[PDB]
Design a protein around this ligand. Structure first.
Ligand SMILES: C[C@H](CCC(=O)O)[C@H]1CC[C@H]2[C@@H]3CC[C@@H]4C[C@H](O)CC[C@]4(C)[C@H]3C[C@H](O)[C@]12C
Ligand SMILES: C[C@H](CCC(=O)O)[C@H]1CC[C@H]2[C@@H]3CC[C@@H]4C[C@H](O)CC[C@]4(C)[C@H]3C[C@H](O)[C@]12C
Lengths: 1032, 100, 250, 50
């Protein structure tokens, strides 16, 4: 406060320090997109070879959803159960939870569960992870020279590249687009029938011949006295090649001759499965779908990948380039620079409005030198508290130039004024200026964090989102307070050039003197007229309440957003079909699609990466994801080239002439954060009524919810619908009477039509799986059954048709279950007049109209309580409860803090315009920017008030003969700050392409606010004060 | 009794592939012995959570368990958060020579 | 001690002091690894580790002790089961393997309980019948009818090789190395004259650093970047107190 | 002078102490017998006790 005003350097030291400090904080601090905002995602998976979903959900699923319990912070439990076998079971945990033991208490109850699931599920490997929820980034691979194929590439990748990636410091779950190679034995039944052979025999001979063996040793320990030698014994070893796999010996036919595997099955070195096949710009291609492990900096994890493929590049095969189709890294490392850019335009733009007014370099460098110090300093408090550099926190930075600006401006200006008045050398002037605004500035240190703090304690998804801002600024704030107390005034002592007693330098320049006349004189006109409002104190008061009613009216017309959708350069599109139509029928879809993006949208579309047989719902043969990429921003000038337009018009081309249900979307703002777009209902079988009634109940709801298209639309099921299923009923009595083992019958169907896992051969130095499964042609249609023959108790074959029925009935390929019990999930949205807070309740009730046993419940994206409309105006309350709680203390009146507070509306009714007049919205960034303007609003007034107080108490002047000199002796600080800020927030409010979506809410809001929050503040606050005062 | 190449292709590799998605993983050894014995060390970042460090290995040892041969399973696997070298030794002997 | 042991000896034995602080063995030289990043298999990789050592001992003026760690390639008795023959004699392959496995390596069976604490039961061929090659054809198995067969009736037995210690660094096969930084230049240079001879190798083999020599250390790298920041900030304290920029020098 | 001296000294970390407890390792043409090994330990245990 003073130690340093006499001693220029002790400031310079502490100054230098938080400069050096935040500097070694830019560095050692993780640059990220936003915070860790995901509610701790856990994910149990498990597979079951070829098996149907109802023999998956009753044999792997349920034996988990019952051994699972006693688990900390458990929130709820999904269960997508696939006709592919695959069986996810997600357990969400409380936000902020111990991500790690969260993952653990699942493992324990997966182990008390292990040996209940069938042997195959056990040997096929379960996979518990702490994965994210959606794709981090994708890694494209292709063939230049065309010396390899659409599964040879997958292999090279999966055997050389993926088996490192997955082991790198919190990489939750990597998904390979395709398959590592696998020894495939293609069984032929003609050749099995003739030679008297079951797939049973084929399976055993594999487990016999291709296997590594328990060894032993010569010179065995313990030895019988002095031997010379000791050597390990090698026996039989796993087979290395298609060639020697065909060599396997089965029978030794009637006439001495041999029947080897080659003779009963076409051996092929192929894939572990044939549903997932990816096509990068139509050329055969494999990929790596990297995913996060909650509590993971991604601008860390993906910046070190890189640090795994910057090592796999030299030891490749001939012609195998990498390609980048889906990247969330080019963005956030541009979003960053492009706010840092704004924060040097924001300096250079002040360096001017700072100058104009004071028109003197070695003075201007003061309210300039402040910026770095507090900012660098901010960087420091962040680092060592709990946060990481990000978007939300980067904006706060720009948004905080405000509560840095003034108290620099006003200290500096203060001395101009002091040197414009009495005639005190820069030094003396400062202590005359500072001991005259000391507590005033220490006032705005608490009162303006009083609106800022409370919004840090926001709940759920919005939580950390708000906690970023409502602290990033707070720090920046209190560090502009201890600065403008200790370094700023100190500098004001030093480099601030002396000015003649009663100057203003009117006209006396030629350059800028004709520039000063336009102010000092107009400020005289200002004050003569602020005496003119103060006569007619009433008539403006009545203008004000109108402003308020007006304001409120505007506040209720704007719609509810969260964080606005950005164009990302990377979006995607999903493909759905009359389920159980072929992988090939699907490829005709991806082909029509990849076409559109490479036909008409060539302009913008860089690269599509379409994957066949994989859904953003779940697996199958009729599921498609097409990962797009666009060109580099600048090469897409207008709205027509921004995502909004493309996807919109894209759908109107696809489905307007189509057979199946396919549409493209922009991925919701922030990866994973898909908790904004509508609602999500679940329907629970709480009476054991079984699925077949529950498909039926979900019928009656949709059918009687589409009755109101005036409160909700899209009331539709999520996942899949009831396909038909070929059912084989084994006549035991007959089959037993023919003397054929039931164990034989099942395995020879299972292993024929679904495939079987057997041994693990070792190709090239890495074990891979051996799959026996009927050759392609002998497994396509109903009658293909009676080709299949089994060996009996005597020793002769039997057709399946001799002992089987075969009837066409139904089933569900996707059996869901919410919290153990069967359930049927729902996906519709909140009709364009009423919110989810009402579209929820007109759906919480039609569910009661249902049959006895079926129930309702809410899960995921719509289970929370949100921003405005519920509990934001209960914190807003507590923001402007505590602002008032700060002021009365300082003004020694309960009837004076009103005067400063009544300015709150004056900024709002401007910000609300910006937001209304420009097609915008009420969202986080805005509410943040709204908060900002509420601060500046008082900051500006607080002064005018404080001084008015000052000159009435410490110098004892009348009410009117005071406010005036207050409104006059500091009018400049306001106009200065105002014009600086608006011309320093100016950039954002323009801006294109890179993450500007935010940059305009942040801007538009603050600008339009900060405009009116001044050319109104300068009038009404004196009409506040005085009329607040004429009520003692 | 098994030789090392029927140890490294049957217990080793079925771990070094089911192992992943693990926090602060640094690198992974694999000494594979003609005795059978088969160490696999995963070093973690200095100052790391020694404990869940030990844990995320257990999980991926369990998603791996029933791939290794029956004997390896019944002979017991042993995951620990051990040191790297001898703390202290405790010698025992026979005075009277009534044992061996 | 060493100059007494090895100066008249047949095998490689030497005594050392355990490096300062238990576990903290991250000081004494370097540690290289060699990785099979093309699936070339071990038998070429023993071979590649050959060419490196042989062309790293060419400079005894920047590094010595460029030698492998662990063990080298011993010979192995290999038994190849003539299935066709063995099957024709009508003897189960399941039988054959277990009777060798349990004879020459031992088998874990049940857990008997001695004195109130369970311990393991091990069946394994008695000592004398498991020492040398021909000791195989003592071993007899029971057939589909019910009569015995010698192993020699259905086995080959040839002397070939193998490695008793197969290493692997980060999934892929690798061959670890242990030498030290010659008494004029540091590991910071003995590292780089070894980061390069590894490029002289066949296609597929790679280099990497692990353990005791993967870090960046004290003086010679980043201590004089903190030392800088020590006597940056000492100066940053003084000027404040002396009200001069030209007095803290003093 | 000072600087000249500063660049002549060699690089240590934390100097090796005498601990009262040290150890020695024994290696052989591998797969030579446990018994061939015992002749080694015997020559060794000898030196330390001779
Ligand atoms: C809920 C479905 C997704 C279908 C599903 O759940 O599987 C959603 C995803 C985005 C949705 C569309 C967005 C644009 C349109 C908005 C209109 O105000 C209502 C109709 C349209 C055409 C919507 C129809 C439907 O509500 C869609 C397609
Ligand atoms: C690296 C080997 C260990 C052998 C191995 O890796 O298995 C080390 C362990 C300590 C090393 C010796 C220490 C003393 C000597 C130091 C001399 O400047 C070079 C030769 C000597 C005689 C060294 C030779 C060799 O470099 C040794 C024996």
């Amino acid at each position: 406060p003073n130690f340093f005003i006499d001693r220029p350097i002790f400031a310079w030291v502490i100054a230098i320090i938080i400069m050096l400090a935040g500097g070694l904080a830019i560095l050692k601090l993780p640059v990220a997109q936003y915070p860790t905002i995901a509610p701790p995602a856990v994910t149990i998976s498990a597979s079951y070879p070829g098996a149907d979903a109802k023999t998956v959900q009753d044999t792997v699923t349920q034996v988990i959803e019952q051994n699972m319990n006693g688990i900390d912070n458990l929130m709820y439990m999904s269960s997508n159960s696939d006709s592919t076998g695959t069986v996810q079971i997600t357990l969400t945990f409380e936000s902020g939870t111990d991500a790690d033991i969260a993952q653990v208490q699942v493992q324990n109850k997966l182990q008390l569960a292990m040996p209940l699931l069938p042997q195959e599920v056990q040997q096929q490997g379960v996979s518990v992870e702490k994965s994210s929820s959606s794709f981090l980034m994708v890694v494209g691979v292709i063939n230049t020279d065309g010396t390899m194929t659409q599964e040879d590439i997958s292999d090279y990748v999966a055997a050389n590249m993926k088996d490192a990636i997955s082991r790198t410091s919190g990489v939750g779950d990597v998904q390979l687009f395709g398959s590592q190679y696998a020894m495939r034995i293609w069984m032929n039944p003609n050749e099995l029938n003739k030679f008297q052979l079951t797939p049973v025999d084929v399976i055993t001979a594999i487990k016999a011949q291709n296997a590594q063996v328990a060894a032993g040793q010569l010179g065995g320990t313990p030895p019988v006295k002095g031997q010379q030698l000791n050597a390990s014994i090698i026996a039989q070893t796993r087979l290395t090649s298609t060639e020697e796999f065909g060599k396997i010996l089965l029978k030794v036919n009637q006439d001495g001759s041999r029947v080897l595997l080659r003779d009963v099955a076409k051996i092929e070195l192929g894939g572990e499965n044939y549903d997932i096949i990816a096509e990068f710009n139509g050329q055969p291609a494999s990929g790596l779908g990297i995913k996060l492990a909650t509590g993971a900096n991604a601008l860390d994890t993906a910046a070190a990948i890189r640090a795994e493929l910057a090592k796999m590049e030299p030891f490749f095969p001939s012609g195998l380039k990498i390609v980048y189709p889906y990247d969330t890294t080019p963005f956030v490392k541009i979003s960053i620079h492009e706010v840092v850019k704004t924060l040097v335009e924001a300096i250079i733009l002040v360096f001017l409005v700072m100058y104009l007014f004071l028109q003197n370099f070695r003075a201007t460098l003061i309210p300039t030198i402040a910026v770095p110090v507090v900012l660098l300093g901010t960087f420091a408090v962040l680092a060592a508290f709990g946060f990481s550099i990000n978007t939300l926190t980067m904006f706060g930075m720009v948004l905080a130039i405000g509560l840095l600006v003034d108290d620099a401006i006003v200290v500096v200006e203060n001395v101009e004024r002091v040197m414009a008045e009495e005639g005190l050398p820069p030094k003396e002037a400062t202590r005359k200026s500072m001991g005259q605004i000391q507590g005033a500035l220490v006032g705005i240190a608490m009162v303006l964090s009083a609106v800022f703090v409370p919004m840090a304690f926001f709940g759920g998804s919005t939580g950390a989102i708000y906690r970023q801002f409502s602290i990033t600024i707070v720090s920046a704030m209190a560090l502009s307070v201890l600065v403008a107390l200790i370094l700023t005034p100190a500098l004001c002592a030093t480099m601030l050039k002396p000015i003649a007693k009663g100057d203003h330098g009117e006209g006396k320049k030629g350059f800028f003197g004709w520039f000063n006349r336009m102010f000092e004189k107009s400020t005289h006109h200002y004050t003569d007229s602020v005496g003119g409002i103060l006569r007619s104190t009433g008539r403006y008061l009545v203008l004000y309440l109108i402003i308020v009613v007006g304001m409120a009216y505007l506040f209720v017309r704007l719609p509810s957003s969260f964080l606005p959708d950005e164009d990302q350069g990377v979006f995607m599109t999903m493909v759905q079909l009359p389920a159980g139509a072929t992988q090939e029928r699907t490829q005709k879809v991806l082909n029509e699609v990849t076409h559109y993006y490479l036909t008409k949208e060539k302009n913008n579309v860089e690269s599509v990466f379409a994957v066949n047989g994989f859904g953003f719902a779940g697996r199958g043969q009729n599921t498609g994801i097409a990962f797009v990429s666009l060109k580099d921003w600048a090469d897409r000038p207008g709205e027509e080239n921004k995502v909004e337009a493309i996807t919109m018009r894209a759908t109107r081309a696809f489905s307007q002439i189509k057979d199946a249900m396919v549409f493209a979307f922009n991925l919701p703002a922030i990866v994973e954060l898909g908790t904004a777009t509508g609602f999500d209902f679940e329907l629970i079988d709480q009476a054991g009524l079984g699925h077949e009634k529950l498909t039926q109940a979900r019928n009656q709801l949709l059918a009687e919810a589409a009755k109101h298209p005036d409160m909700l639309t899209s009331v539709r099921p999520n996942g899949l619908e009831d396909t038909p299923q070929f059912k084989i009923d084994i006549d035991q009595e007959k089959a037993q009477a023919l003397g054929v083992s039931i164990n034989d019958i099942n395995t020879t169907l299972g292993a024929a039509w679904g495939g079987s896992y057997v041994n693990d051969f070792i190709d090239r130095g890495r074990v891979k799986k051996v799959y026996v499964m009927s050759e392609a042609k002998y497994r396509m249609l109903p009658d293909d059954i009676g080709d299949w023959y089994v060996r009996a108790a005597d020793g002769q074959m039997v057709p399946f048709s001799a002992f089987s029925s075969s009837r066409w009935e139904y089933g569900s390929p996707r059996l869901e279950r919410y919290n153990g019990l069967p359930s049927m999930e729902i996906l519709g949205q909140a009709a364009p007049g009423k919110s989810t807070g009402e579209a929820m309740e007109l759906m919480e009730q039609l569910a009661s109209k249902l049959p006895t046993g079926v129930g309702y419940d809410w899960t995921g994206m719509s289970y929370q309580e949100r921003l405005s409309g519920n509990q934001a105006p209960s914190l807003y309350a507590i923001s402007l409860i505590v602002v008032f709680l700060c002021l009365a203390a300082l003004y020694e009146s309960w009837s004076i803090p009103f005067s400063v507070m009544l300015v709150v509306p004056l900024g709002v009714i401007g910000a609300l315009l910006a937001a209304t007049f420009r097609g915008l919205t009420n969202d986080v960034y805005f509410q943040v920017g709204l908060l900002t303007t509420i601060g500046l609003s008082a900051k500006n007034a607080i002064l005018i008030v404080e001084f008015a107080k000052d000159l009435m108490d410490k110098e004892g002047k009348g009410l009117i003969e005071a406010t005036l000199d207050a409104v006059r002796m500091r009018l400049r600080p306001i106009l200065m700050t105002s014009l600086a800020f608006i011309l320093g927030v100016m950039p954002l409010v323009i801006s294109t392409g890179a993450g500007s979506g935010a940059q305009n809410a942040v801007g538009t809001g603050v600008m339009g606010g900060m405009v009116t929050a001044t050319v109104l503040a300068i009038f009404f606050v004196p009409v506040f004060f005085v009329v607040v005062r004429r009520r003692f």
